[PDB]
Symmetry: D2
Subunit: 295 residues, 4 copies
Amino acid sequence: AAIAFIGLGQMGSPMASNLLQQGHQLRVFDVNAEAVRHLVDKGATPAANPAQAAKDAEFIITMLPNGDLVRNVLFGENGVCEGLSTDALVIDMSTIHPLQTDKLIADMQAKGFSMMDVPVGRTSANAITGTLLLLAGGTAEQVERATPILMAMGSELINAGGPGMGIRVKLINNYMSIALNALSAEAAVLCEALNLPFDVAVKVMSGTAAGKGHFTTSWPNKVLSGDLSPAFMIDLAHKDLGIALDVANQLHVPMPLGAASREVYSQARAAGRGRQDWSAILEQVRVSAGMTAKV
Amino acid sequence: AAIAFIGLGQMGSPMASNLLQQGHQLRVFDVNAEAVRHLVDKGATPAANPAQAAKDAEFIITMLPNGDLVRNVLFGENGVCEGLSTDALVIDMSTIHPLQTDKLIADMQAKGFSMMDVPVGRTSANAITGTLLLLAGGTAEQVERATPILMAMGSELINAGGPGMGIRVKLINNYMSIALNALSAEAAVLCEALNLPFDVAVKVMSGTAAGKGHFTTSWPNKVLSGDLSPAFMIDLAHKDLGIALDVANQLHVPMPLGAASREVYSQARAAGRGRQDWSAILEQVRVSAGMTAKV
Amino acid sequence: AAIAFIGLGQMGSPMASNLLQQGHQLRVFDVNAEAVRHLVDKGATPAANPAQAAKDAEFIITMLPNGDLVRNVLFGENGVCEGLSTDALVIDMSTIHPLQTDKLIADMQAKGFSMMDVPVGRTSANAITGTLLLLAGGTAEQVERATPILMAMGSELINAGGPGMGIRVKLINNYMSIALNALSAEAAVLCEALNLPFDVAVKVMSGTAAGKGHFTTSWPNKVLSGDLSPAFMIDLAHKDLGIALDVANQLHVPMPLGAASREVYSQARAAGRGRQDWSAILEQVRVSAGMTAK
Amino acid sequence: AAIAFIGLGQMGSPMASNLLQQGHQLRVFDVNAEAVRHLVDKGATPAANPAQAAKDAEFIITMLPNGDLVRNVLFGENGVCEGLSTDALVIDMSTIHPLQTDKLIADMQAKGFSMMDVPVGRTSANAITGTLLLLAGGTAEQVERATPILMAMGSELINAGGPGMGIRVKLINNYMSIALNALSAEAAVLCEALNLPFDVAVKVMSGTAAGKGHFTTSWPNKVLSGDLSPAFMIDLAHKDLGIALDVANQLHVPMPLGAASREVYSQARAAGRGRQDWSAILEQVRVSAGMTAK
Ligand SMILES: NC(=O)c1ccc[n+]([C@@H]2O[C@H](COP(=O)([O-])OP(=O)(O)OC[C@H]3O[C@@H](n4cnc5c(N)ncnc54)[C@H](O)[C@@H]3O)[C@@H](O)[C@H]2O)c1
Ligand SMILES: NC(=O)c1ccc[n+]([C@@H]2O[C@H](COP(=O)([O-])OP(=O)(O)OC[C@H]3O[C@@H](n4cnc5c(N)ncnc54)[C@H](O)[C@@H]3O)[C@@H](O)[C@H]2O)c1
Ligand SMILES: NC(=O)c1ccc[n+]([C@@H]2O[C@H](COP(=O)([O-])OP(=O)(O)OC[C@H]3O[C@@H](n4cnc5c(N)ncnc54)[C@H](O)[C@@H]3O)[C@@H](O)[C@H]2O)c1
Ligand SMILES: NC(=O)c1ccc[n+]([C@@H]2O[C@H](COP(=O)([O-])OP(=O)(O)OC[C@H]3O[C@@H](n4cnc5c(N)ncnc54)[C@H](O)[C@@H]3O)[C@@H](O)[C@H]2O)c1
């Protein structure tokens, strides 16, 4: 296929290189002339600006640091829009703010142009080998059309279920993993302060929600089924967390996420949830966010 | 075997019931006379106090709400110690402060008495069916001796590797799972506020550290191998967490654990770890706890 | 008066010394024999245990690290209760858990003994000079009776208004000041990271709730009067706190209290309080604590 | 003087009204035509856009919700820069990100234009009466030049000491007061849950760092003098904060700022500061922010 690729950085350059290896014709643009020359050496055609890159391209891929730069590349001076066909598909593979994604897609649709969000998971090492995780936003039609192109850059495609849903599922995944790392560290350092070998804690946690998560263990048959009858009461969870913070404070292991979590359980007790299943914390957070109670 | 059981509550009563079902002779005590009578009706003998329960018992099991009550039952007026044989073994199956466990074991040893910590995982439904997770503290000799008794009450025994290591691994496991529930709720409510179906997020998270945990994914080949070369840089993790909190604050989804987690990443940046792997957060927390850097 | 003093530490020793200086007869006990000897040299009588110290004393003062030790000294082996007259008054000047204070007072009353809570503010340098802040719990009768004794050890007495109210107001004051220190540090370090001289910030904050507090500025005529019509809207407070956290995160100034505070304002916005006065955060916290909205 | 005023909202409209009352000639712009009409009725000249407002103005005032809108009004389509004289002075009175202020000032200087930051303290009622607190950033020359104009809108001018220092001191002040409100609420609700009348707590706190602040009480003679010898040891502060959180958790009073504060004191203990004065928390936060220890 005829592809424009705009943004030839640590991720963009290996992604564009993989597309060339699968026999696509690339017109490439980057403000860094050296990044263009390295792709021309691999078989790309250089463009002077995004509009030139987009002329007669079927797919236009952006891989840029932020939503302001995506907006400039699409709508700015000699932007993609000036060279773009109504039949072409823009694929933004950038990780940007989800509401910026929505406004870019809407602003494109208003001019008769098609744009989808396919941000990626995993590292620049995965970008090189073509083993990225593709979190495919866009319509069902756009995902079907883009799939052959996307599978040149990644090894696994998740259909996120609509325009702007790729950037949203990347955000939820990364929020959870990045914050989980900080909590994981508190548990591991408290373990070391107690002179418990870490392997013993990992062995036990691998068989509980501690190591498997709540999403598929504690939650499905309780809160997610509308049943808050207790397996593990909020009062007992609150008590055990109190003991963990008493130990941490005695042993000078700072546990900011633990301390914050206990005040969430305290709010749940204040709201009358003490004798509910611990999965009711999901309902407490939904109500705290101004959502309508489901149970 | 001849067994004393002290504490016949939601967990203690079914645990004692399972020991009777396997043919042991139980002498039972609880301050709630009705809980005694329910076990006497199943073939237990009554005791008027802990000292009477312990007289001629080989194993003495306590299942009590907190370490002050365990101490009172062992050392208080008409306590276990007054009726206890030096050949007998005390098994505290309570979830109590682990340094209280250490002091109880030491105080017992000073009087010539043997005590081990075997707290349990899983809930009262599992107590009824005899399918508790047994987190066995104590010496190798104590665990070997107790095992036949313990397997009446639980279906799986983990040898925690020493005196006080059962209560330690119970605390680390529960700390992690209890706090993880609050973080899990933030991610799920932010997902709902973004109009992304939860099952799509769970499908993505099931393949990453978000759903599998860091302990066995991100950590083993990086921080735990002494390698902090970046797969996912702390600077990029910190940036993505900032976007997640910007979105949450726009959508009024309160995320106290996420907010606290970003200030931990900010401290890591301040400490010069921005270009290190995100698994370096473990080292940041260790150094924050006054421990010597390993990397 | 005849006084027993149990606990002769950094605070207890100078407090007992001031009572001797005002002409009281003290019987003193501490598990640290050297602390007893220092007071005996100043004219105290040594006692071998709390019961001996209490024998024929009119006032019994405890100044101890925690409520378990106060309980042991009153009710334990050779405890005060074994030497205590029903006409005597026990004064716990310790900072302990307020519900432990309530139970000690009740347990003493059950045995026919009178006990009050009079913890103190200010530090060991004030204990030496007799310039402590006296936070007097107890009945009006107990405060009247104790006052002449207490004014040997402190320069200002606040009548906290009942049994257990002294330890309650000590806890609220210390909670606020101890946590406020951590927040103050975040503001000061963000100030330094921005290259703004601290003196300029303190000059501005001295004229606003930042340096004067909300209790007597923002709150009285708004939330405390039942009026949540906005002077400074929660939405604008939330926005400005977002900017502060953006700056802190760009400059790697860790601000855990600020970060936590923004999620409280976020909860207030979710509850529909965005266009209310910022003093409505008090009502948000009351509702979050399961109290009936005012 | 000839003044352009862009942003005629809750603050901007009364500020522009006070400039008209003091005899200035105003050219006004707001995207809300009704807000323009209210000022035109008081004698302002309407402008169709920021460039038109700025034409022949000596002073150009912006009072806008955020730094993106300030940038759009100055540099965007029909922006101030298109109508601006190199002899004119731009005054941003908005509360925006201070590093955005620095970049706006620098971007203006690059085009030969002069810009200063003068955000305001106090509320819309003060904007109406002309009694705002003026937090004047800019060079000494710019503050001197702007002062006569500024004193039409505010009653008190603080010279913050340089370009970008007005927005920095506004941000430190608001950060502190906004976060302090949430901590104040936790102390007040714990007070209610303990059945202690709030006025008794306020009376005690008004005499301590709890109600007076640490900046001018605890800090000057200790950390700010390089003296960390203890008046109130970090270990004792950490212990008392533990008791307050135990009580709050027993009484289901959520205290997220208190909880976060205890983990900062815990970090201080881990770093070897347990036996230092509580004012050493400032040094702990500085070191946590990657600053060189004092
Ligand atoms: N780096 C990772 O480990 C990783 C992992 C997964 C996803 N991501 C996402 O990938 C992106 C990071 O991209 P990267 O690492 O290639 O960044 P990079 O900074 O290395 O490359 C960005 C490129 O864009 C170019 N560019 C900037 N403005 C431009 C413009 N107006 N027109 C044309 N080119 C322009 C730059 O010259 C540069 O070559 C983010 O969106 C990030 O979240 C990163
Ligand atoms: N319930 C759960 O889901 C669960 C799960 C795992 C572990 N645990 C642990 O089990 C313990 C609590 O057990 P439970 O759930 O049966 O509690 P419970 O409150 O249902 O029962 C506690 C029993 O102890 C008795 N008791 C209290 N003081 C006593 C005394 N001085 N002497 C004798 N008896 C006394 C009470 O009367 C009561 O029958 C805790 O340590 C808890 O952490 C509970
Ligand atoms: N130190 C301060 O800055 C300060 C300020 C206000 C209030 N307080 C409160 O004062 C109380 C005591 O304070 P401190 O600074 O004097 O403590 P400290 O530890 O210096 O003194 C306590 C004394 O009690 C003695 N003691 C311990 N157990 C005893 C027992 N069973 N019988 C007799 N004596 C016993 C110890 O030997 C010691 O001398 C605490 O509640 C503390 O919070 C202290
Ligand atoms: N309201 C307060 O209590 C208070 C206190 C002190 C400081 N401030 C600061 O005052 C500033 C403005 O606040 P306000 O309360 O007057 O806000 P406001 O929302 O009431 O007014 C903003 C005005 O700007 C106008 N505007 C928006 N975009 C524009 C554009 N491109 N060109 C021209 N006009 C435009 C809007 O129509 C509106 O009239 C903010 O930075 C705020 O932080 C407010």
